[PDB]
Amino acid sequence: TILKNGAIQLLKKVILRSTVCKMDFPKDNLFVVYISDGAQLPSQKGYASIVKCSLRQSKKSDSDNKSVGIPSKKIGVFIKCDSQIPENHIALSSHLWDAFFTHPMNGAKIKLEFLQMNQANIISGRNATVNIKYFGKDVPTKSGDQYSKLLGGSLLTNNLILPTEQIIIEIKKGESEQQLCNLNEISNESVQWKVTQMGKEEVKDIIERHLPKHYHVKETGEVSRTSKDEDDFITVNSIKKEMVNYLTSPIIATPAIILDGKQGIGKTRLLKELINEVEKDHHIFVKYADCETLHETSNLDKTQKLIMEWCSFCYWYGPSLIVLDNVEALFGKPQANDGDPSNNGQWDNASKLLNFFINQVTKIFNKDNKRIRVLFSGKQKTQINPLLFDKHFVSETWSLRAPDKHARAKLLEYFFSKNQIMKLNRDLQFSDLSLETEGFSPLDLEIFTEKIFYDLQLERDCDNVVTRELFSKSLSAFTPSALRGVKLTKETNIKWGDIGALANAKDVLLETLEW
Amino acid sequence: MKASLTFSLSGIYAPCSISRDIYLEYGDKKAECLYGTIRLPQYGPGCTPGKIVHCVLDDSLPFCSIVVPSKLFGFMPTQPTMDFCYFEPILDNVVPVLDSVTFLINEQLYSKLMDLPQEMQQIQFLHYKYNINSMETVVHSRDILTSGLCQILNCSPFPQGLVDFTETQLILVNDTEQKLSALKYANEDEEYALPKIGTNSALSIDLESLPCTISRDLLRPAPHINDDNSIYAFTDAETLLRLDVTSGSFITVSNMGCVRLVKLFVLLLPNGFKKRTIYAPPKIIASFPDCSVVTISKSNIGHTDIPIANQVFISRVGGWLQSQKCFQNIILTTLKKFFSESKRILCQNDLIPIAFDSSMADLNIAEENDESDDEDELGQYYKNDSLVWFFVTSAELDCFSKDNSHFIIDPNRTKLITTNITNRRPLPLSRSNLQRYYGFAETFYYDLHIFPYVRQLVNILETSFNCSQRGITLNASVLLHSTTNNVGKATMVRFASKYLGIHLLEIDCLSLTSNSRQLDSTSKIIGYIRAKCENVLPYASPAVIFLAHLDSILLDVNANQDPEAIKLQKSINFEMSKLLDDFTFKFPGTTFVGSVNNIDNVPSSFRSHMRFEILVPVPSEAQRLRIFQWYLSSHELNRDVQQKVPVSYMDNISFSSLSSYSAGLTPLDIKSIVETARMTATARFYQESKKCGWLPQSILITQEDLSKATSKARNEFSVSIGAPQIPNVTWDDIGGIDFVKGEILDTIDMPLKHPELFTSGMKKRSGILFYGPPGTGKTLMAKAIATNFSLNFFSVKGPELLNMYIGESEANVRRVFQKAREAKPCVIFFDQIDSVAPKRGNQGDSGGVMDRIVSQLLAELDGMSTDADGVFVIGATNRPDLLDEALLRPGRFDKLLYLGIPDTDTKQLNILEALTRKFVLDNDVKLIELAKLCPFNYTGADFYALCSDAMLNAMSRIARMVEKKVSQHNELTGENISTRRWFDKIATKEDTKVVVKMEDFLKAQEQLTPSVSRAELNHYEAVRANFEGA
Amino acid sequence: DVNANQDPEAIKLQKSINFEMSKLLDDFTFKFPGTTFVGSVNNIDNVPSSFRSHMRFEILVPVPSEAQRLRIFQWYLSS
């Protein structure tokens, strides 16, 4: 088939899946897309688009008419071959995402088309022209030459929005195909650029299109957001390695994994880094729930819709993963009993959801092993509803035991660095500094460090971070989370000494309590 | 790589000619003998495992073509052969060498082999006989060297590899049973030019479902762009010759007034389908209540079919899915997609199958587009999970009304028009396995000859089916109940449905409201049920309404309840009862198939109507064998994974032992085992692939893995019942307790090992208790049994049972025994029985609950109706006299074992060695004087204190030594580190290894007291005298 | 605090606020600088763990001693 322009020809349609493996290249290009090594590329250039996801549109599209129906948009793209990315996946560089007005999520279907053509490759075949018009609230006017250097330096197609700087690319030269046009193969003397501001009426008319404002939540820029309170993670324990090795295996036993823990011992941050890792080098889509934020859990019919929606999305996308922090809120057996029929104790209001979820998941897992998998976490293994172990949903388990001596050093080092002002004296060292901190955990440690920062800042009458001989005193005033909740006592002030003839006993005590 | 294929009658080990292009551009030029691997693509759910071959250059072969001996696959190229395969030349020409190969030989050749004089001479004779060479010839498995003479019985290291014919062991086995006579190289069952002369009119032949889908690439001919796969039929070549046309244009199938037009292709040779039969897909078969035999005829006028496609009339068949709100949209879309094809043909009374994905009900992929909108490749990601039909009635005739038998539908002229819901019977499982064809999640294929209970259900349903022409309202409700979850009730129901071809309604507990039911919950339930049913029953004949987990909805009256809350329960009960019988006489053939996990709680008002109640036992030894045979089957493992390397089990597995070793496990547990085995095998395969060693082309499950996967499954179960994590004591620590050791062995294990002599209902004396002075192993023996015997170990933490209220102790005891009884091979450890079972009815006691509880013990422990005696009971006390006699009887506690103080230097040395076992002892001195110097009033526990004290002293010595070393270092430096810092900055592992020298023992022994006085010991001695002296 | 002898619905709706109060403290601490959450209680033992641990500083306010009540008197009798 030959395109509307007689010099351009169509070859074949193909479908692939997106990835965020961060393939990079210089500024000259904006629409580079990386195909995998394998079947040779029938053409160097092409067209691309994404098949938009949508709900069932039930209840008249959730009471929204959606009268402005649009068939998305068609884009042109460079395509290049790479060896790292798997066969079925497609790499979509940082640009051209904002064109689709969709966040660069891991998995999404790409329609890809290979384009052939004869004439327009010739250098300076005809003069090129285009207008880079400001769409929304805009930076003051700038030269079109630097815009061309920055925008579509090698290739572009009309009707492309860009919310990254609120601009529109347009041209109506006349008798023009309104299709793909190459730029870097054309000399500067055979191309023209101009800039204007778009009319308010046309701006609001275009705003009617499907343009989800990505920065509706306040941000300082595309490269900086205040949400990043913590932007590092310390490889204290092997478990992150384990889960990465097992969860991503080509074949798995049972859909589910369970991640137990203890009060603040690591769970949420560990899962958030597991997301941040697994999303990159293994092309796994992830849906994060945090069931606590989920409202109206006990409304079974309403919650069931979200339960179905989760797995529906997860199945539509590529090999995916489901993760629930603090599961016991949504699928937890109350376990409190005074009198109840055995069947209702087996099947109460909460478990119904669990059975539905299990059945729905198994419906997929039993016909596509690598498609969908779930990863629960909760305060305690056994505490969770027995259905999981009964129905054989969870197979392997892991526990975040409190970090060992060798590990705490790294954690304290990192938390000390985080405040960027605290530092030890030449005479003091980390590894010894930790040993007194027995029975702690990262919550304990982080609050203890803040406590040290306060006690050094005012209570020592010094500006610089004097950091010895107050450590013990501060610790004395501290109470680890575990101890904090039960009836310990330190009331006795009588010193280590004050011994008498009780030496013959104190020896023994040393030999059985301290040694 | 894809290579053109042809066959020859050469030898099995003859080199395989390969084209010059492949031999040069991909074949290794440095290899003296080039080896490759070939995969034969065949009509099935997956490609065959690769077979290795040796190849050589051949200039006569055209572009990308190969020639191989047909005898490598047990046939000859008389019938049309396949035209291509997938091939790859091994990189680096890596191949493994088998250490041993097992061959099966005929009697005559074995006699010849003895007659042959010498081992080397026999080796050379075999070399000449079957072209087997050392380090040159490659062998395979399950192959035949020659028809009816020899066969490769087994190959241990790998399915295929080189043979070190100079050293590789050849396990030659004489065929004493003449099994080799069953071998058959695809030979003909004779052949006649004209078995019937001039039979051009018609031929009668069998019809059976095509076992799997068909891929166009495997087709010998070159059909057009469209309208092919809907009317395919396949047969043997000679059957085509009997029809006088080789793969003729069109055929017609006519019986019982139904005539259909079909297309017949040739069945390709390598497939192992049956002979002289029609193989067709479900599309055509569904049209008939087909007889096992069917007649076919030529139809040349089919080539001149007419496109009269105007205003066609379509109808949705009755069915569970068709009446669902959400599915209807995707059903419409997929039907329009199916009829979007240019040239599909159709005729009246035809059933057209329509597959679709169950979970895409909500994923509207995109709106209709002006151009470049198509589904073909977009669908490849998802595979279907549900299936429906559509029933076609009439069509326009136009000026071509002279004939209406068969016609085409054209999208340029056909429009979607539909009538109301029709009805028609499904397809019985016995005639066509639709799931198999469409790769669905196959319902387990029960075998009525073996499983008792399923036969009852199928018989009842088929009786209600056959009574249709008797025409009476004999239909009866059926209730399934089980002692435990996950026993396949819903599966067996689905089996019955598919077998008898009965539309199935699967209502379940995905209800709308169950908490605070006062909010009109009764309506929300019953109206939902009535609406769901009423949209299906008037169009299903017969029909089945299946209510899963009915137990948790029709709850019975509670003992303690709100007086008005229970009213809703009563109302729902009664209305359910009403709607139960309403369907009985509002429609013919309706059967109510309910399921319950405990029949005790079903309401008597509802249950009393019930007239058939089938208990579904956990599968016994016989069944588990079949279940394993199923889940391990090729058509199960290879499914649903899409791994690029097919899967299979190694033939060395053994159903018979596996079954017996998996006792008590439910089917779901079995599947869990299989899945875990699959995981471990895949992990092994990818680990080997990561390594530099030879890479198998298939991943093989191994019994050596199942042996431990079953153990892990059992440990999972043991965690389910909440048993404690007892420490890992070993059977060897127990020391000087040989007598009691053997006594315990004679009961815990003797009737458990070789379970045939004791296999009877006898009183197997499941009771035993230890009694005697403190600290002589009573708890340790239990701790050992807890892990060394694989019996579930329940701990009764002293007076754990006793409780606040009047009757909850009596509930706790019964709950403990009930839960233990759930897992038959279980142990009960009553630690310090004194606290729980004091002497009944003494004056010096108050409250009386201690009497009630001991009475309850006496009751439940022994009682009457007791069976499955595997529940052992092990008790311990310091002193038994506080126990009541009624416990000191056979059936409860037969022998009281007095684990007394050893009083014997042999035993003393034995216990001293057993205690010292696992830590190093310096051998410069002999330990026996430690026995000789202690008086016999010393006790097993105080010898433990002796050993630990001596150890602690000897290790305090090392502590002082390291203290001296660190002090010296601090003196050398600026005293800048303590001991703690020393232990992370510096390490002297070998220095810290404390080794005790018996001087330490001779120091310690002077300081430690006996654990009991003579006063107490004489007391326990007298106790023993009373109980044992007699 | 968590109630061991209360209906499950009440316990769940109480856990809801117990968690959300922590979440609210987090979000307010994040949103603006200087925001200082100063809560008060009359019996520490009743505060849930989910809040007892996360909180930084605990100050024990005692019954005034001799040196203090003198000042308190001198205050409340001032003109």
Ligand SMILES: Nc1ncnc2c1ncn2[C@@H]1O[C@H](COP(=O)(O)OP(=O)(O)OP(=O)(O)O)[C@@H](O)[C@H]1O
């Ligand atoms: N290994 C680690 N590396 C880096 N930061 C860590 C690590 N462990 C904990 N932290 C930090 O300490 C915080 C402690 O809270 P954490 O995420 O462990 O608890 P949580 O799982 O949300 O708790 P809860 O169990 O109460 O729901 C983390 O949010 C993170 O900021």
Ligand SMILES: Nc1ncnc2c1ncn2[C@@H]1O[C@H](COP(=O)(O)OP(=O)(O)OP(=O)(O)O)[C@@H](O)[C@H]1O
């Ligand atoms: N006897 C069996 N043979 C084969 N598969 C079985 C058997 N019993 C159960 N299954 C498996 O279990 C699933 C369906 O049966 P399932 O265990 O859900 O039965 P059920 O009667 O609904 O159980 P329950 O009411 O105890 O939950 C399928 O995955 C099926 O393969």
Ligand SMILES: Nc1ncnc2c1ncn2[C@@H]1O[C@H](COP(=O)(O)OP(=O)(O)OP(=O)(O)O)[C@@H](O)[C@H]1O
């Ligand atoms: N003969 C022995 N063999 C092995 N270990 C022994 C022996 N005698 C004593 N011990 C050790 O000393 C302790 C004695 O354990 P034992 O089983 O006698 O405890 P028990 O039943 O609680 O005793 P008690 O009679 O005081 O109630 C254990 O730590 C055990 O390891």
Ligand SMILES: [Mg+2]
């Ligand atoms: Mg958390």
Ligand SMILES: [Mg+2]
């Ligand atoms: Mg069930």
Ligand SMILES: [Mg+2]
């Ligand atoms: Mg004891």
